[PDB]
Amino acid sequence: SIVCDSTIENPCIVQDSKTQFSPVIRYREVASIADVYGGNITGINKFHLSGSEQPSEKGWEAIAESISRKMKKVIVLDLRQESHGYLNGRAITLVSAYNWINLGKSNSQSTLDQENWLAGLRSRKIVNGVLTVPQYVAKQYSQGKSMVVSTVKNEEYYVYKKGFDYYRIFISDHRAPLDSEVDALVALIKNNPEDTWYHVHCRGGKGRTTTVFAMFDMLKNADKVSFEEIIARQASIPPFYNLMVTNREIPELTPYYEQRLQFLIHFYEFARQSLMGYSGTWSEW
Ligand SMILES: [Cl-]
Ligand SMILES: [Cl-]
């Protein structure tokens, strides 16, 4: 064996949930923008759209209860390209630098690599080297804990138990979606009833989820609401993620945030033209 070092050759097992019982800390519902935002709220209040970070086992119960109270088919939209799953009910990720373990891979290969990784853990009596986020950030690669394996599960296990559907859109962390994934999101929305509830999530519940919320908003409203107002209103509810802000916590990620913003500007124009009569796909546009 080898202690991890955050390279694609020797990636780290990082536990995202403090425990299997940890609460959801970036849960929000897009429709609440209508109750909070002081600008243009046209077209917001009828969305059936919630989002979060990656839940713990118990977190899925909280999300299901939140959705039930608001309520229709529910689709959980996992935006994560990177391999992830659960070890004894705790959310875990296979982490290389900038959380890009599956960067450049086909979606097929990303799934195969995840399921092979999880199968390897599942076959062990004990898993070693499980880092917390603070330990990973501090590069304390050899200070991870061991866990006696009770269960190793993918997200689908928990989502299906709640009677929800699962659909994966493979977006690299900190980046814009690729054209295939944009087409897949637009089609998913078109191909399900207008009343469908989507619970959207990524790893941290920040950039990817907010990007997708903005895309949903543009697809419905870009012909009547300005780009500026869409982005600002999506920033008005917790966690207050403003897609305009491209200088964030990690300076080395600025290029990707900038490219994501340019994507959003182009998607806005596509969405507006689609509401004005353009019948083709994003890739064709
Ligand atoms: Cl298992
Ligand atoms: Cl406006």
**Resolution of this entry, Å:** 1.4
Q: What CATH number has the domain bearing residue 178?
A: 3.90.190.10
- Ligand located closest to 223 CA: 2
Distances in whole angstroms, Cα of residue 26 to Cα of each of 157, 190, 191, 203, 237 = 22, 27, 28, 11, 10
- Ligand located closest to 89 CA: 1
d(CA 51, CA 215): 14
Q: Is 71 exposed, middle or buried (0-12, 13-18, 19+ CB in 10 A)?
A: exposed
Q: Where are the beta strands (DSSP E) in the chain?
A: 12-15, 28-29, 49-52, 74-80, 84-87, 90-95, 126-132, 145-148, 152-153, 165-171, 197-201
| Cβ atoms of residues 263 and 176 within 8 Å | yes
Ligand 2 centre distance from Cα of residue 242 (Å) = 17
Q: Is 248 annotated as a binding residue?
A: yes
Q: Is 203 annotated as a binding residue?
A: yes
- Ligand located closest to 221 CA: 2
| Cβ atoms of residues 43 and 224 within 8 Å | yes
Paired with 197 in beta bridges are 74
- What is the count of structural domains for the chain? 1
- Ligand located closest to 43 CA: 2
| Cβ atoms of residues 162 and 39 within 8 Å | no
Q: Which two tokens stand for residue 12?
A: 């780290």
Residue owning tokens 């897949």: 184
Distances in whole angstroms, Cα of residue 221 to Cα of each of 32, 229, 236 = 16, 11, 17
Q: Where are the beta strands (DSSP E) in 214-281?
A: none
* Nearest alpha carbon to residue 267 among 285, 245, 243: 285
Range of the domain at 81: 1-285
Ligand 1 centre distance from Cα of residue 6 (Å) = 26
CA–centroid distance for 206 within its chain: 8
CA–centroid distance for 8 within its chain: 21
Residues with CB in 5 Å of ion ligand 2 = 40, 225-226, 229
